[PDB]
Amino acid sequence: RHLTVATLEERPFVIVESPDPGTGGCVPNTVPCRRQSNHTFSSGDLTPYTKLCCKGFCIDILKKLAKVVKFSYDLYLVTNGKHGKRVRGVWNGMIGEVYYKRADMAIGSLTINEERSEIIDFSVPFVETGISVMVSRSGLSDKKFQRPQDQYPPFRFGTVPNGSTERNIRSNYRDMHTHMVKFNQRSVEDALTSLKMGKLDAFIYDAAVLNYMAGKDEGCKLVTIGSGKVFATTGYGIAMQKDSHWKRAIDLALLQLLGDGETQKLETVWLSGICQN
């Protein structure tokens, strides 16, 4: 009844914080979490792991899963790679920690693709999302995307590399992928600030995170197309080790709770925005 859970920081779903110094721990709604510390990175036993408080949407849903299926869990943040990629045929991140079994399950901004699926068993997706483009204030058939390196002043747009979106683009748009590798970005908010003055024209990434951006945006900059026009409809789901027994239980519990409608309230309290409409 205990599992290994690991994630990294993706703002609206993952929030890391230092524990309250005046209390030692912190307020409720948060769970203890720690650095990814291996045998070499154990950093001694005087401070075996720096306690941190991790709270968020995924934290709440995993809390409900634990309280339903009656299982415990230990949480540690991930350092080696963001989430996972077949780097030289070797996976990293949560994908590496699960496939090579330093981890039991995974939760977070885990986009489900085909490759991850044959690599890692997934659950039913608890939320829907996919590809979207956001620009300061038109479709994957537009010359702005079809051949942005042929006419006009070169159109300056990009994304973050080593991601599922990058995998799909490289697998469908290798010429445009070669164009985009010129425009890679350190972080989502980094490119956001870049386009706030106009370093890059538009950003291509998850629809959900851009919804969270624009919903709280003070400038109210909207995505390339109303309603996002989400391409390659996918979601976020629980990642299980290959043919793990937990699959049936977690799927049944997750779908039952999704039908109960409280997930609507959790998304209302977590990812809602101000000027989204």
Binding site: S117, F122, V124, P125, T233, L255, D260
Partner: protein, 280 residues
Amino acid sequence: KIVTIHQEPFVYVKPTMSDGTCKEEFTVNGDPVKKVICTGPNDTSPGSPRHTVPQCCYGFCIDLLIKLARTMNFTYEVHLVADGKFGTQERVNNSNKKEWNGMMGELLSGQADMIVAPLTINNERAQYIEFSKPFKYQGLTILVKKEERITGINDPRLRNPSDKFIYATVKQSSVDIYFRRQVELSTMYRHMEKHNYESAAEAIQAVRDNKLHAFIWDSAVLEFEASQKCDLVTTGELFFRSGFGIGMRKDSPWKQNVSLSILKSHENGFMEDLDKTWVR
């Protein structure tokens, strides 16, 4: 074995000609629509003489099943569901155990081995039918004609039912299961058992005839008919978002194959091309 229900946004069913073949009907792009011969009763069984007349059938679900069949290289047989209803466990008359009907029952009996339809995933089905990953995303909404814009699932006029406002859903359907689970909504469920319809066509016409006031159903279906039929509008947000996922029998090996197939179809957007072929 292919089983389904005639659903205009996803399943088009027409009578074959006297010669027993499908019409050479081509798309606006000039390519013919890929149509098969699905057998089954000529009209609904109570009103029908129970003649299992084969009829031409084609559409979105048909297109995707053809694609995935070409991917897995297997033949098939197409035949719609006998009762015309989705189905659920029910302590039927003179019985004790809650028993499925519809295509779930037809599969558990073995009449069909896998379902191809815009079926909704619910936990109740999850215990008995293996759902793969969703192939489409959709939601639940309300439809009216053409002034008291209905307040989604938050209007008291729904919460305290009135004889001036008549509304219902389809029996033995996913929305029935949903309204049955939320006991707080039970009163509207009590309204349901008054006027529940049996198929989309009659309910749509009755709303167009104002026999009904508002109909709760899939987002995709309502937006499709609105973009094609007009004169009627959906209202309120998608109070319950979910997926249409291709379901199939428990523990049969093909689940992983079809799952990765629909994943790679989402990778190249082939399903998006299907939608553009079917939703303009």
